[PDB]
């Protein structure tokens with residue numbers, strides 16, 4: 632309570648500074664959006680969503696009966712960039728591992744025409760998926776701002792997106808990444824590799840009392856960084872604000 636806003640802002644900036652990155656973290660409490668970090672002007676800039684799009688890919692695929700939550704997506708036997716992708720998995724496992732080939736298969740099942748209609752219907756980011764159904768979230772043309780990502784997280788956390796309640800609950804169950812005291816953190820990461828590289832961690836804290844506090848971390852990744860810096864800055868920021 633007694634910590635100054637000047638102190639909170641300095642502390643959260645220092646987490647991005649110490650990571651040798653440029654970034655923001657947007658926190659929403661009710662309808663109020665607060666922008667913190669060491670590069671505040673990133674808040675209304677467009678970036679590819681990268682693997683954060685898996686949240687909406689999963690919602691679209693489940694709602695349109697392109698998969699079930701127990702369905703096992705078989706590994707095709709081909710070598711992957713990541714050896715942990717060389718296995719058969721559900722959408723939920725794919726969400727935790729960020730197994731791009733599973734979300735590419737799901738996107739192909741949905742198909743371009745339905746995917747473009749659904750992305751337009753949800754009003755996600757710039758809403759433009761272009762002509763390639765299996766990589767539009769990774770290389771463009773789809774883009775989104777950190778403000779738009781925190782607002783998407785707020786919509787999903789409160790079941791406000793235009794999908795069935797059951798569809799939204801199914802995808803939320805796939806996004807639990809941490810429990811701290813009685814808090815649960817739901818989030819999806821992204822890393823647009825191949826300069827400048829974008830890193831994301833977008834989600835919400837569900838506090839003990841039931842309050843949901845959405846957030847979106849957006850930062851420049853560089854060759855040599857650990858992906859876990861996204862988690863570390865996010866957790867330090869939320870702890871600094873007493874959200875966790």
Ligand SMILES: *C(=O)[C@@H](NC(=O)/C(=N\OC)c1csc(N)n1)[C@@H]1N=C(C(=O)O)C(=C)CS1
Nearest residue numbers: 681682729731769820821822823824825858
């Ligand atoms: C999702 O963000 C995804 N990222 C990618 O597929 C890459 N680029 O995205 C636009 C990528 C990977 S290797 C390369 N040359 N380009 C997954 N993200 C992570 C993550 O940590 O968020 C992964 C562990 C797997 S790939």
